[PDB]
């Protein structure tokens, strides 16, 4: 591996590991802050939406996210995020943990005695730079398709003009319900952006950041793991434990991970266009 | 400052900034048989070419004696893809109280090419180095603003056409292609060695005094180094006093200055994304206004 070709290369014995968006960290007086910084206008809005969504996570009480402090608007524009400061290092040892909490995140909305009935959030939240609509639906697949990969797709007309995407979408649309009858979806709270750069872990447990939540299936947050990787394989062993893959998941993944493909068009451009599309085409065929 | 606004807004005396890492290459530290060395690994194709650039950059710093930067160990094709660059370990905090002692020694480093036993009288390098991860032309050119409109901006803007496809950026930079002469108030610009990527995460400071790493470097206008530093702050004032003491503003420095950062708002963009269009297209408005 990596550590063997290095003590090769160099000719060591010993090779021992020491020292572990514009986000700086600063040592302060009442405890340790971590502090995000975002130049453009819309950057109050992203933060709201960001605390908004740590406060719903911290308020099940099942997954460790840092604590939200203060929101400052920029001289010249633009807002800093100060938080509360927490000593992370790559997800692994408590990748089953992590899992374990996940499905309990998922299942806390059913289970509970405040039970939110429909999909969608009580604020807008960004994932990555993009606003998204988080207006209650009854329906999943009416919330999914209209407010995520609508959306998404609208953009990508806008901007680029895209006709393939515009007739792959004209086929879709319709054979989006196959994916999910005869199945009961329950509203799930989501981290919502539960890529493996958004995870780590200190020595007490799992940590997760930087969410964009709203209530939606939760199969809906598997995909970006499973996609990009960088999770152990006993996060997703210790999830399916406790929530078990549902008949079509495969399929549906491939929905899930479309929007994301999507996103990451319209954040990166073009790059991004050959997977789109070719999601699209791998579910029509 | 943002440090004085977060003193206030948190209510904190003291705020000093602290710390894988890096937004390009993973970097980690390890204790070896001969002492410490930091590595930076980067899966990607295109990264011996990267890595070799920054050793070809920290090399030509080197040779001035002039700042401290980390000596270029070795570069390693990996399995899979990719390469790993292993380089001397620094113990390094934020740059602090040895701003106003880099403000001097950046100067010092500009001027060397006219001041020294150097007689580099064209813009541009020896050998490709990447922004970021993206390769750069270096081809000698005898006229800064030719060299830094064709190899610069435009390199940049062709590839937000080709992965954006964005009219307005098209559209104002034929506009701006027009202006960019008139700018340069008919100075004599001397070609200067630059470390290429002086933001304030490249610059650190021990007990010695400065240092800086991660450079990209090549011959161009020493105005160009400042403006990535001034544009994601992070440099206290002495710095840049102690620097214009020995290098004053030409004359049109503010208005270069925006042209400068164009290039970094669009190497953001094409970097990072969208995020970064705003600021890209404001910039080229307010050069055309
Ligand atoms: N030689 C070194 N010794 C010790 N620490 C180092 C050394 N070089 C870099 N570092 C540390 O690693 C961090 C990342 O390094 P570097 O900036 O070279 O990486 P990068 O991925 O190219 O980052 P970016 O291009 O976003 O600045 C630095 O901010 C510094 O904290
Ligand atoms: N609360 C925190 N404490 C310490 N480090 C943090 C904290 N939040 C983020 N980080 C560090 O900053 C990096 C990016 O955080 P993230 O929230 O993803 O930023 P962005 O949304 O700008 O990408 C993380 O990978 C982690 O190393
Ligand atoms: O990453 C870099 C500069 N950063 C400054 C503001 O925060 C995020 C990026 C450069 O060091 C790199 O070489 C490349 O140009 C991509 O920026």
Redesign the pocket.
Do not use: R, T
């Given at each position: 591996a990596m550590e063997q070709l290095l003590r090769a290369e160099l000719r060591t014995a010993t090779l021992r590991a020491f020292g572990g968006?514009?986000?700086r960290?600063y040592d302060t007086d009442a405890g340790?802050?971590?502090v995000?910084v975002?130049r453009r206008t819309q950057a109050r809005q992203m933060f709201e939406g960001?605390v908004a969504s740590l406060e719903a996570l911290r308020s099940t009480g099942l997954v460790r996210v840092?604590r939200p402090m203060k929101v400052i608007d920029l001289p010249g524009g633009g807002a800093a995020f100060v938080?509360?400061?927490?000593?992370?290092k790559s997800l692994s040892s408590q990748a089953s943990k992590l899992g374990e909490q996940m499905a309990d995140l998922h299942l806390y909305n059913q289970k509970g005695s405040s039970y939110v009935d429909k999909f969608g959030f009580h604020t807008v939240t960004c994932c990555?730079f993009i606003p998204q609509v988080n207006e209650w639906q009854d329906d999943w697949p009416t919330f999914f398709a209209r407010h995520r990969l609508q959306a998404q797709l609208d953009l990508i007309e806008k901007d680029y003009a895209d006709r393939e995407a515009r007739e792959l979408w004209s086929r879709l649309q319709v054979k989006i319900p196959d994916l999910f009858c005869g199945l009961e979806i329950v509203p799930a709270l989501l981290h919502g952006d539960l890529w493996s750069?958004?995870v780590?872990e200190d020595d007490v447990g799992p940590?997760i950041?930087?969410p964009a939540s709203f209530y939606g299936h939760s199969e809906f947050e598997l995909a970006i793991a499973l996609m990009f990787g960088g999770f152990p394989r006993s996060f997703f062993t210790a999830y399916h434990r406790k929530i078990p893959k549902a008949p079509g998941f495969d399929q549906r993944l491939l929905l899930y991970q479309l929007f994301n493909y999507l996103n990451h068009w319209n954040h990166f451009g073009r790059e991004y266009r050959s997977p789109s599309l070719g999601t699209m085409r791998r579910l029509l065929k």
């Open positions: 968006s514009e986000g960290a340790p802050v971590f995000k975002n960001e840092p938080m509360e400061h927490l000593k992370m990555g750069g958004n780590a940590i950041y930087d």
